[PDB]
């Protein structure tokens, strides 16, 4: 994993460059929006359990997925499904602080589309539960912070489809 | 199932089923005609067990159906009674399997993290299981009720 | 007018603790600062808030001190997502149809008809 700072040091290190004006622009962009990210990271961490409760109610609590025979029917399959939304919200917050989507490829998306196919989990339903979790979060944290969190939700959705 | 649970106990120790384990599986299959009659006594009394068991629950826990509770509303109380039907169905599965394995893998594993996510009081679901046990055990004799009473007893303790 | 410093707050808060609220507002209303400005026939006001040629002011006092502050803000503050069991919605995707849904063209077959 690398954040927005480590991402710029690593790209200049493999070229042998001192930090020029173009690398200093990317470093200034993160330092300016850095106060906006520590504010959303503390408001998402305090409403973590109730964000997923409202995001499931908006997407797939009132479909027939919980009907007998589908996924998330039994208690084990219902509890394991909110644990993933529990995963996606916590790793999209690590990516919004770091300013880099690098941690999602390493610790989330690695072999995940094959894991859902082996288990049978509907991937299009997981994407709409994540799109609801994007709407619930973007109203809690605001428009600027909510538009950054929605940048790393789309990254999980694109790497999952 | 008593058969499956006895095989995983032997396979874990890398051995054959002992004569004491085999002797238990013998009287399990021979008593199958009687155990199938206990499960059918509950299967033909769902309307009385789930209606009475749910009416008794809402009198000991009136706040779950009062305005502001989890099971408030026509559709919400129906889901409330829908869950007592889920747990009465699993108790008939366990009477036939001879073990609490059908109840455990369907509706007991991950049940506390599940209800806490929906905001449902876990102690209000255990109260509705104890009230179904009162109706169900009154339909059976001295023996054949201690058998049915255990599967209701385990679901209470395992749910808390 | 505004508090001079946070020792004026300490000096006057012991009137409320030993005489109650009724003796604190008798002592405040009988200061010469009150009787020279408002007397007994004028409603009080924020004195000298804005300089005569300036465009901005000095943050009027109902906005500078609301009902409660940073203390009490960790017990009197409300919440979002309160675990409160509200009214349900039951079919959320039927209110916001997706792109290829012919329910977006449903109040158009009323127009282009036999007429």
């Amino acid at each position: 994993m690398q954040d927005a700072i480590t991402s710029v040091i690593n790209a200049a290190d493999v070229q042998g460059k001192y930090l020029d004006a173009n690398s200093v622009e990317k470093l200034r962009g993160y330092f300016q929006t850095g106060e906006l990210r520590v504010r959303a990271a503390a408001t998402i961490a305090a409403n973590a359990a109730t964000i997923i409760k409202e995001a499931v109610a908006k997407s797939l609590l009132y479909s027939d997925i919980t009907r007998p025979g589908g996924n998330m029917y039994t208690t084990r399959r219902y509890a394991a499904c909110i644990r993933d939304l529990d995963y996606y919200l916590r790793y999209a917050t690590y990516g919004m602080l770091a300013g880099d989507p690098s941690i999602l490829d390493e610790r989330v998306l690695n072999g995940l589309k094959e894991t859902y196919n082996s288990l049978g989990v509907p991937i299009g339903a997981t994407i709409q539960a994540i799109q609801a979790m994007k709407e619930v979060t973007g109203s809690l944290v605001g428009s600027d912070a909510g538009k950054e969190m929605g940048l790393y939700f789309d990254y999980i959705c694109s790497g999952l489809s | 199932s008593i058969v499956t649970k006895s095989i995983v106990n032997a396979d874990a120790e890398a051995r054959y089923l002992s004569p004491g384990e085999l002797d238990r599986i013998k009287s399990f299959v021979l008593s199958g005609q009687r155990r199938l009659r206990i499960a059918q006594t509950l299967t033909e009394n769902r309307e009385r067990i789930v209606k009475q068991g749910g009416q008794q629950l809402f009198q000991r826990r009136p706040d779950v159906v009062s305005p502001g509770g989890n099971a408030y509303g026509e559709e919400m109380t129906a889901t409330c009674l829908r869950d007592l039907d889920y747990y009465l169905r699993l108790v008939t599965y366990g009477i036939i399997a001879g073990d609490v394995t059908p109840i455990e893998e369907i509706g007991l594993v991950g049940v506390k993290e599940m209800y806490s996510a929906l905001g449902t009081p876990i102690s209000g679901v255990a109260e509705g299981i104890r009230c179904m046990k009162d109706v169900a055990c009154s339909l059976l004799s001295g023996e054949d009720a201690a058998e049915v009473g255990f599967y209701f007893d385990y679901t209470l303790a395992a749910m808390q | 007018r505004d508090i001079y410093n946070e020792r004026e707050k300490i000096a006057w808060s012991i009137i409320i603790a030993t005489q109650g609220l009724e003796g604190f507002i008798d002592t405040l209303l009988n200061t010469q600062e009150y009787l020279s400005n408002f007397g007994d026939s004028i409603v009080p006001f924020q004195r000298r808030r804005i300089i005569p040629q300036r465009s901005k002011g000095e943050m009027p006092f109902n906005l500078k001190t609301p009902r409660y502050g940073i203390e009490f803000r960790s017990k009197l503050a409300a919440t979002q997502f309160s675990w409160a069991s509200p009214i349900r919605r039951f079919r959320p995707q039927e209110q916001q149809p997706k792109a290829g849904d012919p329910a977006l063209f449903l109040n158009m077959v009323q127009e282009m008809g036999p007429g």
């Binding site: 479909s63 027939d64 025979g69 589908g70 299009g124 | - | 079919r91 039927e94």
Partner: peptide
């Protein structure tokens, strides 16, 4: 495998196809 087990064949829900009018 176990008691409550998922399979594509015994899945009659609209979970793999998002027909949201059902």
């Amino acid at each position: 495998s176990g008691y409550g087990d998922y399979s594509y064949s015994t899945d009659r829900t609209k979970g793999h196809v998002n027909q949201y009018y059902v």
